[PDB]
Amino acid sequence: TQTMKGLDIQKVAGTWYSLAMAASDISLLDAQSAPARVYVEELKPTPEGDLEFLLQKWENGECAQKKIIAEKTKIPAVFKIDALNENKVLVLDTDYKKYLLFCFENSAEEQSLACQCLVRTPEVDDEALEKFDKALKALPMHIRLSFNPTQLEEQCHI
């Protein structure tokens, strides 16, 4: 999976909206509480070059928040979120101003992938979705979801 060249995380800081998601397995995304059904509300780069994700997810009939620190590696667009190196964040592309494309990747067994198209403003951006679909063309996706602007403004995209 080819990641972005020359990523500057200092330029991705701020509030984002999960506009579209795709995954390698239907059960990762289909249910309201599916394991990879997580909404990115904020990206915070650290001075050390880590990227904090502020996530929301539906659990037990409520919206819950979680911070995930993705730690820097030798590749600037590849981050690790476990000490066992099975689970990664891959940044595929961004223009910084409008959209960011990233994947959660698990390579422990069958690779697992869950990818998102983030936008800076809670509107549909057809350019961002086109770039998302082109980025995914090489990957073995079996489910895609896309959200409307009303959903983008609500906790857990209700």
Ligand X SMILES: CNCCCN1c2ccccc2CCc2ccccc21
Cα 129 from Cα 135, distance rounded (Å)? 10
Residue choice 140, 150, 154, 155 for contact with ligand X (CB under 6 A): 140
Between 73 and 151, name the residue whose CB sits nearer to a copy of itself: 151
Site for ligand X contains 113 (CB under 6 A): yes
Smallest CA-to-CA distance from 1 within 145, 151, 146, 114 is with: 114
| Cβ neighbours around 147 below 10 Å, total | 19
Site for ligand X contains 93 (CB under 6 A): no
Site for ligand X contains 78 (CB under 6 A): no
Q: How far from 83 is each of 36, 71, 126, 155, CA to CA, in Å?
A: 20, 10, 37, 30
Smallest CA-to-CA distance from 44 within 67, 26, 21, 27 is with: 67
Residue choice 7, 16, 105, 119 for contact with ligand X (CB under 6 A): 105
Site for a copy of itself contains 139 (CB under 8 A): no
- DSSP strand pairing (51-59 vs 17-23): unpaired
Site for a copy of itself contains 26 (CB under 8 A): yes
What mask, x for binding ligand X by CB under 6 A, covers residues 9 to 38? -----------x-x-----x------xx-x
Q: In the complex, which residues of this chain contact a copy of itself (CB under 8 A)?
A: 26, 29-32, 141-148
